C-alpha cells in the first residue's frame, strides 16, 4: 500500500478539512487500498513570494503529484495564482485551479501545467452561440474590450460560427468616452449587441449607450457574468440577458470534484510503465518531473460524469468542458433566471423573457 | 549603484571582478532563485542584477520575471535558462534577457533556406511554448510573400504518448528540409526516434531554433550529425564579456535615472512580511560601445547576437554563418 500525495492551496482552514475529507472519500471509493492518497495542504498566503516558497517547503517537499488551488480575493497575487503556476510548473507538476476564471491561464505557453474545474469567461460564448441558434440569429454585433480577455471571447465565438455572421468592434480599456464606437454600432444595422468587458468597462459602455438611446426599444443586449455583477448591474439596461456560472463560487464543491478527478487519474496513471515519483522539494532539483507531462495529459483526457458540479471533462488547453451556466434576465432591477445552459442545450424555464422596453418572448422551441 | 552578478561554472567563470557583488550559483531551483535574490535584496541593497545559469530549464526565465515583478529589481538574463525564449514577459516586470525573439530566429532560418533555394520543406512542432507563434510567423511570411513554397502542412505531435505513436506522425514527412520546434528535452526523443526511421540522414536537413540548441556547451548523444541551428550562446562571446555588456545596460540606465528625477529607487525592504518610478523606461534604448543593447516591451533583445551553427561529425558545434550585423545574414558558402 504505497502513498500518493495530492497537494492543495485553499483559502480557509475549514476548506482544508473538506479537502482531507474529499481525499478520504476518494480512498473509500474504488481505492481498494491498492494506492493510498494523502492530503497535503496549506492555506493561501497573501505574499506572492512567501506563497511560492510555501509550495516548495510544504507541498513540493511532500512529493505531491498535483496541487489544487482556490483563489478568492483577499490579498496580493494580482488575484491570479501566478506564484504557484510557476513553482509547480517548473517541475511540470499539474496545478488545478478551482476558482480563477481568467482567460490568460488557457494558454499552455504561459501556464503549461494548469487545469481548471471552471471555464474561462471566454467560454461564455458557447452559450452565446447556442442562444443565436435558439432564436435563429444570424447577424449580431460583438463589442469586446481590447485585452487578452476580450480577444479570447471574440475568437471563441467566431470559431464556433466558422465551424461573416458578426461585425466586431473593439475599444481601448479604461476609456470613459466610447461614444465613437456606439455611433459606429448604431449605424451597423443590427439589433443584437454582444458585450464582453470588465465590471468597470461595462459601466462605461452602459451609460454611454444611455446617451445615444441604445439602452431600450429595438436592441438586444447579451452579455456574460462580469457585466451583470457589481456596478455594471446597477447601470444595466432593463431587459438585459447575462450569465451566472453555476457553482462557480462554490469552493467546497470544486474541492471534492477536483479530488475525485485526480484520484481517478492517479489510479489509471499507475496502470502504465516507467513511472517516477514527483520531485522531493525544490532545492537541489533543476529538472522536470519525468512523469509530469504524461500525468497532465491523463488529467485532461479524464472524464468524470458523476461530478457534483456536472460532467467533468477538460479542454485541449485544460479548461473545463460541460460547465452549466445560469441565463439571467434583468427585470425591474432584479436578475431573473429565464433558463439555464444544460451543457449541451438551453433548458427553457417557466419564466418569461422581457426585452428592453415593452415586448416579451421565451426560451421555448 | 550596487549590482549583483549570479553565474554558474559554465564557460569557465572564476572571478568576475559602482559596486558589483559576484557569486557562483549552481542552484537553479525555484526556492534558491527566490532565496538568493531576496537574501541579496535584504543585506545588499542591489539595484539591479545580471543572472546566468548552466541549465537548459526554460522555467528559470519565468521565475526571474516573477521575482523581478515582486522585488522590483531589474534582472538581466545572460546565459542558460535565464536567456531562453519564454512567453511574453510580465508588463510590470524589469526582467530582460539576451536573446533573439521567436520571429527573429524564424527570419534567419528562412534566410538560410532562401540562400540554398530550399523551397520545399515541412514543419514539425510540439505543444511546447512558441508553438502558437512559430507557425503563424512562418505561415504568414511564406503565404504572403511571393516565392515558391510547399509547406507540406504542419505536423504536430505530443512527446508524452507511447513511442511509435510519435512515429506514425513522423513518417508523414516528405521533405529534405524539416523545421523542428520543441524543447531540447523533447528534441532528444524526436531526433532519437527519427534516426531509426532514417530521417536524420544527410539526405535530410533538420533546422531547429535556439530553443533546441540550448547551451552550446552541452550536446546530447541523440542530436544527429549535421544539425543546423540558430543560437545566441556564442562560445566566443565571453560570459565574462557579457556581464560587462550587461553592466553597461544598467549603469547607463541608472545614470539617465538622475535625469527626469535625481534619485535612484532604493531596493525594497524585504520580500517577506506584511516604487515611485521604474528604470523600465531607461533600459529599452541603451547604447554601449557601438553595441545597440536595446530591448522591447516583449523583453527580447533588439540587436541579438544570433549565430548560425551546425553539429559537426566531431560532436562539436561550429559557426557557419552570422547575423546581428544589421538585417541580413552572412553564410560561409559551404553545404
Amino acid at each position: 500500500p504505497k502513498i500518493v500525495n495530492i497537494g492543495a492551496v485553499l483559502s480557509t482552514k475549514k476548506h482544508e478539512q473538506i479537502f482531507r475529507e474529499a481525499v478520504n472519500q476518494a480512498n473509500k471509493r474504488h481505492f481498494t487500498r491498492k494506492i493510498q492518497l494523502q492530503a497535503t495542504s496549506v492555506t493561501h498566503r497573501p505574499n506572492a513570494i512567501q506563497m511560492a516558497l510555501s509550495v516548495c517547503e510544504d507541498l513540493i517537499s511532500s512529493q505531491v503529484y498535483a496541487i489544487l488551488v482556490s483563489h478568492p480575493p483577499a490579498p496580493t497575487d494580482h488575484l491570479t495564482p501566478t506564484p504557484i503556476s510557476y513553482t509547480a510548473g517548473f517541475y511540470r507538476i499539474p496545478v488545478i485551479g478551482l476558482t480563477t476564471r481568467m482567460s490568460i491561464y488557457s494558454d499552455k505557453s504561459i501556464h503549461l501545467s494548469f487545469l481548471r474545474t471552471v471555464p474561462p469567461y471566454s467560454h461564455q460564448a458557447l452559450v452565446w452561440f447556442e442562444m443565436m441558434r435558439l432564436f435563429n440569429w444570424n447577424h449580431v454585433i460583438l463589442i469586446v474590450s481590447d485585452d487578452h480577455e476580450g480577444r479570447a471571447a471574440q475568437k471563441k465565438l467566431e470559431t464556433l460560427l466558422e465551424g461573416k455572421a458578426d461585425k466586431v468592434l473593439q475599444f481601448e480599456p479604461g476609456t470613459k468616452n466610447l461614444t465613437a464606437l456606439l455611433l459606429e454600432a448604431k449605424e451597423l444595422e443590427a439589433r443584437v449587441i454582444i458585450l464582453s468587458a470588465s465590471e468597470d468597462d461595462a459601466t462605461a459602455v452602459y451609460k454611454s449607450a444611455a446617451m445615444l438611446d441604445m439602452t431600450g426599444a429595438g436592441y438586444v443586449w447579451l452579455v456574460g457574468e462580469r457585466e451583470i455583477s457589481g456596478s455594471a448591474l446597477r447601470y444595466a439596461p432593463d431587459g438585459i440577458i447575462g450569465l451566472q456560472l453555476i457553482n462557480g463560487k462554490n469552493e467546497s464543491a470544486h474541492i471534492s470534484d477536483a479530488v475525485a478527478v485526480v484520484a481517478q487519474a492517479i489510479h489509471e496513471l499507475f496502470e502504465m510503465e516507467n513511472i517516477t515519483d514527483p520531485p522531493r522539494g525544490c532545492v537541489g532539483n533543476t529538472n522536470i518531473w519525468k512523469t509530469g507531462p504524461l500525468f497532465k495529459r491523463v488529467l485532461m483526457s479524464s472524464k468524470y460524469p458523476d461530478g457534483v458540479t456536472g460532467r467533468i471533462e477538460f479542454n485541449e488547453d485544460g479548461d473545463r468542458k460541460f460547465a452549466q451556466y445560469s441565463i439571467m434576465n434583468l427585470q425591474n432591477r432584479k436578475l431573473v433566471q429565464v433558463g439555464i445552459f444544460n451543457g449541451s442545450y438551453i433548458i427553457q424555464n417557466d419564466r418569461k423573457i422581457i426585452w428592453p422596453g415593452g415586448e416579451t418572448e421565451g426560451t421555448l422551441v | 549603484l550596487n549590482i549583483a552578478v549570479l553565474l554558474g561554472h559554465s564557460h569557465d567563470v572564476t572571478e568576475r571582478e559602482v559596486n558589483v557583488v559576484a557569486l557562483l550559483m549552481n542552484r537553479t531551483d525555484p526556492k534558491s532563485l527566490i532565496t538568493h535574490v531576496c537574501d541579496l535584496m535584504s543585506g545588499a541593497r542591489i539595484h539591479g542584477l545580471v543572472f546566468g545559469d548552466d541549465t537548459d530549464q526554460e522555467a528559470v526565465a519565468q521565475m526571474l520575471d516573477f521575482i523581478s515583478s515582486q522585488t522590483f529589481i531589474p534582472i538581466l538574463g545572460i546565459h542558460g535558462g535565464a536567456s531562453m525564449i519564454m512567453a511574453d514577459k510580465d508588463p510590470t516586470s524589469t526582467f530582460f534577457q539576451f536573446g533573439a525573439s521567436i520571429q527573429q530566429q524564424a527570419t534567419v532560418m528562412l534566410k538560410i533556406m532562401q540562400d540554398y533555394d530550399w523551397h520545399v520543406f515541412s514543419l514539425v512542432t510540439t505543444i511546447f511554448p512558441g508553438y502558437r507563434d512559430f507557425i503563424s510567423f512562418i505561415k504568414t511570411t511564406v503565404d504572403n510573400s511571393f516565392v515558391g513554397w510547399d509547406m507540406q502542412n504542419v505536423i504536430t505531435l505530443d512527446t508524452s504518448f507511447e513511442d511509435a505513436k510519435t512515429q506514425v506522425q513522423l513518417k508523414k514527412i516528405h521533405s529534405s528540409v524539416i523545421l523542428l520546434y520543441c524543447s531540447k528535452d523533447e528534441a532528444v526523443l524526436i531526433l532519437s526516434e527519427a534516426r531509426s526511421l532514417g530521417l536524420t540522414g544527410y539526405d535530410f536537413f533538420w533546422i531547429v531554433p535556439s530553443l533546441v540548441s540550448g547551451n552550446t556547451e552541452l550536446i546530447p548523444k541523440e542530436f544527429p550529425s549535421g544539425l543546423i541551428s540558430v543560437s545566441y550562446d556564442d562560445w566566443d562571446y565571453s560570459l565574462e564579456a557579457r556581464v560587462r555588456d550587461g553592466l553597461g545596460i544598467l549603469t547607463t540606465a541608472a545614470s539617465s535615472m538622475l535625469e527626469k528625477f535625481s534619485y535612484i529607487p532604493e531596493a525594497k525592504a524585504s520580500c517577506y512580511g506584511q516604487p515611485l518610478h521604474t528604470l523600465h523606461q531607461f533600459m529599452v534604448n541603451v547604447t554601449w560601445d557601438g553595441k545597440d543593447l536595446s530591448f522591447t516591451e516583449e523583453g527580447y533583445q533588439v540587436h541579438p547576437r544570433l549565430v548560425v551553427i551546425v553539429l559537426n561529425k566531431d560532436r562539436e558545434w561550429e559557426k557557419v554563418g552570422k547575423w546581428e550585423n544589421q538585417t541580413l545574414s552572412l553564410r560561409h558558402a559551404v553545404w
Epitope: 478539512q17 505574499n47 512567501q50 516558497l53 510555501s54 517547503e57 | 517577506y272 506584511q274
Partner: antibody, heavy 119, light 102 residues
C-alpha cells in the same frame, strides 16, 4: 535541512527574569507559527502558547498569562520566551515547536532548554 | 479546555507484533488530532499529521483515534502523546510508554 536551536540551560533564582531563544534555520520564517511547550520532569506536555509570525500576534494560554511573553525578531529569524517573577514550579524543560500552516501541528521541535528555578 | 485521555498508558508488545494505542477526546476534535513520539532523551517528534515513519498508521475520527504500528521495531521504545489541535487551549494526551519484550 530544517533545524531549531535553542539557548542552553539556565539557572535563575526565584523571582528573577529569564529569556530563552529559538534560532530558526532551514525554512521560510514568516510561513509558520512558533509554539512553546513546557515539560516538567516527567509531568507531561503542557502547551503554553502560539505566536503568528507574519503578524506578530501572541496567543497565550489562560494559565500562562501575565508573566509570560513571546518576543520575536524576524530579521534574525529567532523567537524568544521571557518569564518574569520566576516561581519554583517553573523548573521544567521548555521546547519551541514550529507550527505547520500557522495553527496546525508541530512538525519540528528544538533540542530543549532546561530551566531550574532554585536557590 | 478539552481533556485528551489516553489509556492504557503502558504497553509491552512483543517485537514484530502490531501495536494499537488509544486516544479518546473529551469532546469532538474532528480530525485535528496529531500524534507525537518522544525518544528517551530527545524532543518529541511528529509522527502523524491529521490522522522509519512508514510503519505508523493513523485511523480514527471525531472522538476515537488510534495509532497503529504494524511491525514494531526495537527502536520504537518511548512515549507517545496525542495533541488536540482543534481548539484552544491546545491540549495533549496522558501519554503511553511503549516498552517491548526481549
Amino acid at each position: 535541512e530544517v533545524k531549531l536551536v535553542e539557548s542552553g540551560p539556565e539557572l535563575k533564582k526565584p523571582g528573577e527574569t529569564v529569556k530563552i531563544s529559538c534560532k530558526a534555520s532551514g525554512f521560510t520564517f514568516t510561513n509558520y507559527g512558533m509554539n512553546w511547550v513546557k515539560q516538567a520532569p516527567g509531568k507531561g506536555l503542557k502547551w503554553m502558547g502560539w505566536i503568528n509570525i507574519y503578524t506578530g500576534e501572541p496567543t497565550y494560554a489562560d494559565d500562562f498569562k501575565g508573566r509570560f511573553a513571546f518576543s520575536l525578531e524576524t530579521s534574525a529569524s529567532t523567537a524568544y520566551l521571557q518569564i518574569n517573577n520566576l516561581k519554583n514550579e517553573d523548573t521544567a524543560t521548555y521546547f519551541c515547536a514550529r507550527g505547520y500552516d500557522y495553527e496546525g501541528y508541530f512538525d519540528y521541535w528544538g533540542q530543549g532548554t532546561t530551566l531550574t528555578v532554585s536557590s | 479546555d478539552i481533556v485528551m485521555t489516553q489509556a492504557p498508558a503502558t504497553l509491552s508488545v512483543t517485537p514484530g507484533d502490531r501495536v494499537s494505542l488509544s486516544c479518546r477526546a473529551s469532546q469532538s476534535i474532528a480530525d485535528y488530532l496529531y500524534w507525537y513520539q518522544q525518544k528517551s532523551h530527545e524532543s518529541p517528534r511528529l509522527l502523524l499529521k491529521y490522522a522509519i515513519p512508514s510503519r505508523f498508521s493513523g485511523s480514527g475520527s471525531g472522538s476515537d483515534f488510534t495509532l497503529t504500528i504494524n511491525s514494531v521495531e526495537p527502536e520504537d521504545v518511548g512515549m507517545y502523546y496525542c495533541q488536540n489541535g482543534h481548539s484552544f487551549p491546545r491540549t495533549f494526551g496522558g501519554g503511553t510508554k511503549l516498552e517491548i519484550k526481549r
